[PDB]
Amino acid sequence: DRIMQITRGDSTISSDDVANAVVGYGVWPHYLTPQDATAINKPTQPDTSSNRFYTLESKHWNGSSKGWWWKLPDALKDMGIFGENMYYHFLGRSGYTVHVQCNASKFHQGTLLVAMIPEHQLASAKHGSVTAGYKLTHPGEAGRDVSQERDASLRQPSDDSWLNFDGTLLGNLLIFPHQFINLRSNNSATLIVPYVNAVPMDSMLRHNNWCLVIIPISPLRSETTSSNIVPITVSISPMCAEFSGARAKNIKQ
Amino acid sequence: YFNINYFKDAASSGASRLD
Amino acid sequence: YFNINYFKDAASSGASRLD
Amino acid sequence: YFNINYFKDAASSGASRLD
Amino acid sequence: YFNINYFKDAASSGASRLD
Amino acid sequence: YFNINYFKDAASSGASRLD
Amino acid sequence: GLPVYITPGSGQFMTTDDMQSPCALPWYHPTKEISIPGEVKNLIEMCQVDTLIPVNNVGNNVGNVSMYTVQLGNQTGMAQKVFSIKVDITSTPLATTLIGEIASYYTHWTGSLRFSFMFCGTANTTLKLLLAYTPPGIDEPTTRKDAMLGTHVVWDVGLQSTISLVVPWVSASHFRLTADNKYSMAGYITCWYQTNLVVPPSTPQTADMLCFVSACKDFCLRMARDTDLHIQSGPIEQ
Amino acid sequence: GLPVYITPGSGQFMTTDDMQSPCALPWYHPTKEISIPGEVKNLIEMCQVDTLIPVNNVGNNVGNVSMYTVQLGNQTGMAQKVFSIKVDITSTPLATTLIGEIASYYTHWTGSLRFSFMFCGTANTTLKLLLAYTPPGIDEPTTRKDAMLGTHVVWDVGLQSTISLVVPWVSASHFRLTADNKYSMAGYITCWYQTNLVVPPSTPQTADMLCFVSACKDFCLRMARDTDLHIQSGPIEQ
Amino acid sequence: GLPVYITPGSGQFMTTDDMQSPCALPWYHPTKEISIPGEVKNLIEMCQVDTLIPVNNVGNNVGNVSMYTVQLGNQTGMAQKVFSIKVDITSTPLATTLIGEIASYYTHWTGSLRFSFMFCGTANTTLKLLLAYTPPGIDEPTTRKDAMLGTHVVWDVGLQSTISLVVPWVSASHFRLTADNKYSMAGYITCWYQTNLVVPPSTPQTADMLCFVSACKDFCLRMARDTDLHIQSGPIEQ
Amino acid sequence: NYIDEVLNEVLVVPNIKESHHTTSNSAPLLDAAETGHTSNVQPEDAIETRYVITSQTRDEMSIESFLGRSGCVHISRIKVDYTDYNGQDINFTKWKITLQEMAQIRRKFELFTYVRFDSEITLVPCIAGRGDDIGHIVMQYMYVPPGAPIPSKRNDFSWQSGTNMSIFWQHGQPFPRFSIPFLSIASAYYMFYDGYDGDNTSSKYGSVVTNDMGTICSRIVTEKQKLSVVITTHIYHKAKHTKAWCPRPPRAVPYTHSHVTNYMPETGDVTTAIVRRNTITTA
Amino acid sequence: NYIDEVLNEVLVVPNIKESHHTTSNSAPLLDAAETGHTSNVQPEDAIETRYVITSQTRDEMSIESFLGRSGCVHISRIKVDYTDYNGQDINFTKWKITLQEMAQIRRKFELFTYVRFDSEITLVPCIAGRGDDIGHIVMQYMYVPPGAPIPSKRNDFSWQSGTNMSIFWQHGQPFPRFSIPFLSIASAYYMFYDGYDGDNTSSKYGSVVTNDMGTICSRIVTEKQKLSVVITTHIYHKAKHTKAWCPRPPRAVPYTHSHVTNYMPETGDVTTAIVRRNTITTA
Amino acid sequence: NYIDEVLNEVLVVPNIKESHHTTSNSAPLLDAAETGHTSNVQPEDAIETRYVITSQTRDEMSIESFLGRSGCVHISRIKVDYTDYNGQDINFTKWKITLQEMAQIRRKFELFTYVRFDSEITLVPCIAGRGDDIGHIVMQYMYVPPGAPIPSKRNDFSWQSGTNMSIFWQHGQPFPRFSIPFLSIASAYYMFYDGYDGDNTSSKYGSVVTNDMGTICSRIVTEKQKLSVVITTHIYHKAKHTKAWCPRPPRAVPYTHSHVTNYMPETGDVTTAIVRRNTITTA
Numbered sequence A: 001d002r003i004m005q006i007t008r009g010d011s012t013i014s015s016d017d018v019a020n021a022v023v024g025y026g027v028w029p030h031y032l033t034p035q036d037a038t039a040i041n042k043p044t045q046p047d048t049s050s051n052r053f054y055t056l057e058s059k060h061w062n063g064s065s066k067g068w069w070w071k072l073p074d075a076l077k078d079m080g081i082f083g084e085n086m087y088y089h090f091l092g093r094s095g096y097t098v099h100v101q102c103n104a105s106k107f108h109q110g111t112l113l114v115a116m117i118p119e120h121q122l123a124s125a126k127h128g129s130v131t132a133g134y135k136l137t138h139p140g141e142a143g144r145d146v147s148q149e150r151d152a153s154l155r156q157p158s159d160d161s162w163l164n165f166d167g168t169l170l171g172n173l174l175i176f177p178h179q180f181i182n183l184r185s186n187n188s189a190t191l192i193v194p195y196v197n198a199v200p201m202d203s204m205l206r207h208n209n210w211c212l213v214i215i216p217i218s219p220l221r222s223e224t225t226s227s228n229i230v231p232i233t234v235s236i237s238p239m240c241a242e243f244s245g246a247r248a249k250n251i252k253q
Numbered sequence B, C, D, E, F: 001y002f003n004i005n006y007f008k009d010a011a012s013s014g015a016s017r018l019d
Numbered sequence G, H, I: 001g002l003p004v005y006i007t008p009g010s011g012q013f014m015t016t017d018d019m020q021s022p023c024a025l026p027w028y029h030p031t032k033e034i035s036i037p038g039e040v041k042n043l044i045e046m047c048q049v050d051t052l053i054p055v056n057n058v059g060n061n062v063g064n065v066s067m068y069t070v071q072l073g074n075q076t077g078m079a080q081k082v083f084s085i086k087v088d089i090t091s092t093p094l095a096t097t098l099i100g101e102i103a104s105y106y107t108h109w110t111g112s113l114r115f116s117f118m119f120c121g122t123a124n125t126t127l128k129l130l131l132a133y134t135p136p137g138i139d140e141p142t143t144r145k146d147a148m149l150g151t152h153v154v155w156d157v158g159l160q161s162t163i164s165l166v167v168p169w170v171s172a173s174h175f176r177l178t179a180d181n182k183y184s185m186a187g188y189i190t191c192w193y194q195t196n197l198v199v200p201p202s203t204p205q206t207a208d209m210l211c212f213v214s215a216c217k218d219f220c221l222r223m224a225r226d227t228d229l230h231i232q233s234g235p236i237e238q
Numbered sequence J, K, L: 001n002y003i004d005e006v007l008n009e010v011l012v013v014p015n016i017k018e019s020h021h022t023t024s025n026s027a028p029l030l031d032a033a034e035t036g037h038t039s040n041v042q043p044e045d046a047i048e049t050r051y052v053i054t055s056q057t058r059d060e061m062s063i064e065s066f067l068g069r070s071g072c073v074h075i076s077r078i079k080v081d082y083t084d085y086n087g088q089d090i091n092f093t094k095w096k097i098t099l100q101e102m103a104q105i106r107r108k109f110e111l112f113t114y115v116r117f118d119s120e121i122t123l124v125p126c127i128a129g130r131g132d133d134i135g136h137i138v139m140q141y142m143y144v145p146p147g148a149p150i151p152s153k154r155n156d157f158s159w160q161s162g163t164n165m166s167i168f169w170q171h172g173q174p175f176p177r178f179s180i181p182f183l184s185i186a187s188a189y190y191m192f193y194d195g196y197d198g199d200n201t202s203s204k205y206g207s208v209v210t211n212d213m214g215t216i217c218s219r220i221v222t223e224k225q226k227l228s229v230v231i232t233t234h235i236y237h238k239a240k241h242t243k244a245w246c247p248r249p250p251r252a253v254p255y256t257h258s259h260v261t262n263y264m265p266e267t268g269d270v271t272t273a274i275v276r277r278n279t280i281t282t283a
């Protein structure tokens, strides 16, 4: 059966239609083990109050839309509790659940490719050795691209999709944990993903482990009034969040 | 002929095995 | 002295036998 | 492979052991 | 050390024995 | 490693022993 | 000591040999190896995951994304043809594909292969395509009847959405070459309309189908060699 | 004899290899080895003994001894700050220390560390400092509150005299680099007044505190390399 | 390590040695070896199959086929002679023969040999030849009586058709040289009429006999060497 | 094990069984790829297959025979000078360890996110005679991790290697070749990274942040000579005892700069391996 | 086994028994060769034989001692240039693997239709000094199967061999010698063929259709030098672990072209080893 | 042993247990360092620790991997002469064994008072061609303890080594490398000394009184040659089977003279590694 129910905090999400769910690398997210660990302090593990279902800012799906991404450790730099614990601690570790909702009617035609990606080192739009800037790979709930315009003075990434922004023919992207949203069967997309990184707990600020991409493959096509807007809404849930290396507090940027 | 790690360290050895 | 296939692969070995 | 003090004298031998 | 006819053929071997 | 008189003759051998 | 004979090959160097070499910094207890979700052990694995196919391998399209979609159209005529590509897995449009990209690292390939297609159409929309695998022997078929005669699969677009077409392994030589070769010609696959694309009122009349190719447990490669699909007409800076 | 193949590495020389070489003067029964009180077997040992820290790492002071004392003063204000140093054990003032001097012989370090402070004050004198370890992540704290928020230890000067502050190991990478590296930044430690330095009549009002650093059983190093802290811009004569 | 002594021969290269060499592409599981009807394992086998003999080793005949047939004629006289060839298996007409062609790959030969003759005559036709092997010692016989004195076989042409003449092994040296040598002279074989070739009415009066030579289980060769019977006064192009 | 390992039959592929026809309900050929999963359909499913006992190993399709092959990753060069010997930054090389500085191999790895392995090395000095006689030319290749005295010029004091590694090769003796662990520090080598040096809007960001395994300095001992030379001590690298986690799409566009992913020619409107077709209808 | 194998007495030939006279019916000397079979007659049959216990082995008459012998199959040559180094198609060789390009050996095989075997190799660089000093000259012999970047010129990027085989030999070190399986693809090496590329009345037809085991490219590293040279790295090949099916008549006429069977001199009215006799009557 | 020794897990460090809070009397964080002893406080004591199973070996932190590494301790040089061969004190070297004459390594030891060990050696002749051809140049490195005929010049009679050790190296053959016990005389090598030669207010005082393990004389056999040369036979030393007693503070100031501790530049108001800070308040 397609219907699905998910409960994460004080929050629950439902979906009367779906394309299974996917567990990234077939591993379920959980808490760190005293074997692979390294740190020495007792991690704070906000349960529920933290690893709950936060929903971001919504977006429009255009016939001119090109694609939009959000970087996870970062998308919730504001989402209460989790996103505070982030700033108060050096080491942060956590896994997520991605609920991608995008409905329209059975008279619509469209296809969205959704994918998560471990270490998504983007490329700059400008030739050289200048790497994308911080402040631009750190958008927030809002995400990046859309098909937007911007200063070329900024050590700005590639707004370039087909190359995967990293310069790998998108389409091989299917190698990363993914699924689509074929408006003719689908309604959502559900990605669940453990913590992948050569280190037991990284810097929630300097390093974004997971990177999520949603890309219109077959362009939205209705025959309706363009009064009919078909958003795309992303919801996320830290899972098995664990923090440590308590202290002052970083600063917003 | 084999398993004669002529050298002490493990980093020095043939291409591993398969299983 | 013999059957000491110092090398892994089989393609590398002495001239075969007779039978 | 080891403990094959190819040479007589003890002064000639590998880096000692650990214990 | 001996009788290790490293080579196959018999024509190749040390100086024979005595008896 | 020892007593491997790789050579036949006795005149060829290491420095003798002590007793 | 041991009367030894130094053999011909001695002192050489091979970019392909299994031999030990002294450490460099003894007693180095490397960082432990923590647990990490998702580790590979065989290319194969990567080869069994369907990657998308550039097929709209046409002009301006090519540097864009579209280069991936195949719109199923009108068709005034009937029994008309959609597209074709050839099976020789190292041949654009194929090549670039996670598989292709790879295979191009080995000299020989073998086994069956899997082509999957998906309807990015509508819900109320309907269609029926006929896909076919025309083994090596003749020319890519000009007509459907001619192609339907060999290996194929009729595809009924419906509540499902994905039809997967298998490409059996037909060959003389247990093995085929990855490199373009008239001999080791794997054949062609093509797609045609069985019926049409019917859409009730106020639904678009063109729609797309995405296509993919993953391997079969049949599959296997050999004789590693350096790739085709990448010329570093560099160098590379700093 | 033994058909042998001479391998690539053969004939080389490595300043880091374990191989035997013929004696030079056979049958040499070296002088017996008499018993001698205190023999080491591991650098570690030396690393666990607290050596004094140059911290008064300031101008004219530096070539002298003072360069070791930290006088606890007046302080008109309250809740004021004493000093700070950063934890990266290869960073003057640290470096030169029996530990530092060492660590600079290896490429990587790890574990906890111990800082100890002693009051060379008076007997009738009193005070209470707050010491803190500000893990890597932000900037050395400008204010006490801000620093008190992380790892710390309030120190009550009294009949005891020595307070030992531990520096837990907080890091992402099981291991840190000994060499200056923005990544492997271990953080800062700082000291502030909790109360004051009160002295009854006719006692001096400034006094010193000595500080030290020894290792923790946590501790361990690796990848030996040649030191930093010593350039022989010689030579050396006769 | 192992005090070794590098022996004289060391480092050389011999087009005739059994030694191992590192693979080149490890883990290559070659194409399986399917079943194939007719596989050899010993030259011998090829040596035991009778191949046809050029004997009409005469002028214009030679570049043609005839060069293989021997027509048995009229013969006004009686007790007349047919042909002769010498046994030294590396001597045109012999040489070129599957055997000869071969033997010329080795320095020494030995054992018995088999000569077979067949009557491509008629059915109603009749004849009786006398074949003989004149061992080494004297000159190829000028007359039949003289030759009949040694090893021979009278051949009655009839319903059968093939008479096989054996060439025993007569020699001093267990072994003979394949190369022309006055010493290792194997002798001559010749053929003569015993009776005639009688044919009843309206049948041709000349007819042919084909001749062949296969080995005997006696047979054996040694000391491989490069052939005689083929000078590549080339090269060879593209 | 042997046979299986000598015959190289460790990882064998299944065989293709026999099939019959199916006029039945469940349609295996129909799945919805949107689930992001991969189909599971086989020959036997789609057709009326026969029976083929296989015999192909996926041995050579192992991260160790895919990775475990020596590759040029650097070509140290020294155009000697006899005029000024020593001097600052001369007649001795110092290159930053880590790939990128070379294609082919770089592309191979990059096929995966993370990774880990002991590295086997091999040197290949090539002495080009620009003189009427070179003779004996000793060489000193000395590795140097981070925080370490890197020779200012040839004869520093760092070439004493009292506690460093220096391999020596003298014209004649075979090619030096040593190994090396998994170095790094934590768990595995970052095949990429999506982190930075810091919050400094001028901080570094890329797979050059987690990899700084010091540098290696060369230097040709033997001192001053008459007839000149120029050396080119090639470098090959092999990965033995390798591991892999999570894969990713290959790199179709010719790289740029060292570190970094950047794609972006000097106009070359950019370029990829894909070829153009006149029509989809004929291949 | 040993003795039998060391003494080389594995395949021994029968002995010649003793006979007596036969004034009997069945005539073994009479058979009809038209049956295409071969007679079975022996000494003992035809004559009054004696008794000889034999002792000749057919060991050296084995497809492995007939085939298993190293033979020049190619002579790579490089007349270096220092004027233009690199340039396109220079100072680096690339020959098509497979025999024919050399006689003797070619003729040997051809004795059989099919065949199969692991090939052992051996190089033999020969550095001719055309200068007053060569010194150190490194070499790189890198094999390359089909669909593979063949170096346009010397220093391509294909000489990184990130996943290819390149053997290195430096003046002094002994002769390189490696092996190699049975490559090909199916079952055995086509010692001939009666097939074509296709129906194209312009398609290829011959034993060059089933054998395209890529090419091997040479190249002399060390870079630019003063005193010139010319190299000639010989090639020998040996067949170890060989097999054979179905035999055939040797090749009497001097070959022509590579691949192909063609016979046909530049007039040489054609020529074969057969000698001419005055008369059949006297030999 | 193996695993533990191959895996290098001989000396492992304890793990960090888990803690809970303590609102209790005994304060482990308080000790009086004046006792001269060292505190014993740990993570678990001071904080609310977790549980980390460790896996770091203190193997590489052993006086044998700290000491057991080859280091240049001397660079014998011979600027040959052909004009006058022999002559007094020529074309043959004689250096006093013992370190100091070289930094890096010297500093390492000095970390301890006493010490003892078998010494492994390695030579590294480097023949610089100052001529148009060197060819064959034999070498003779002959050690010589105290009271021994030290060659006045090249060809003395002491180069007969009827009872001395002389190692011979000829251009081509690999690098000589021999070992050597613990020599000395009593128990261990004096890493320092606070004694003198005698009461003579002109007696010697330092670690040059207890160490006079004779000298080593070189000499290049082969005799007179045409084209000149200059040699530089480097020297490396490794300590195998080493021991240690009582440690001491490292040496921060650049040494002076051989033997001796002296610090004292030609003005350099003296200098140490310590860096200067503006303020203690900010690091």
Ligand SMILES: COc1ccc(N2CCN(c3cccc(C)c3)CC2)nn1
Residues within 6 Å of the ligand: J097, J098, J099, J119, J121, J143, J144, J189, J190, J191, J211, J213, J215, J216, J237
């Ligand atoms: C990102 O993963 C890598 C990739 C390459 C690498 N190298 C391997 C070669 N190595 C090396 C090779 C030769 C000589 C010396 C001193 C070092 C340096 C580290 N280390 N980590």
Ligand SMILES: COc1ccc(N2CCN(c3cccc(C)c3)CC2)nn1
Residues within 6 Å of the ligand: K097, K098, K099, K119, K121, K143, K144, K189, K190, K191, K211, K213, K215, K216, K237
């Ligand atoms: C038709 O049978 C053959 C006959 C020869 C052959 N060769 C053997 C030699 N080989 C080879 C020899 C040396 C170097 C390299 C790269 C390859 C190429 C294939 N392969 N198949």
Ligand SMILES: COc1ccc(N2CCN(c3cccc(C)c3)CC2)nn1
Residues within 6 Å of the ligand: L097, L098, L099, L119, L121, L143, L144, L189, L190, L191, L211, L213, L215, L216, L237
């Ligand atoms: C103070 O401790 C030492 C320190 C060094 C030392 N050396 C070691 C090297 N050795 C040596 C090395 C090479 C050649 C010869 C003859 C001798 C002389 C003694 N002996 N004792």
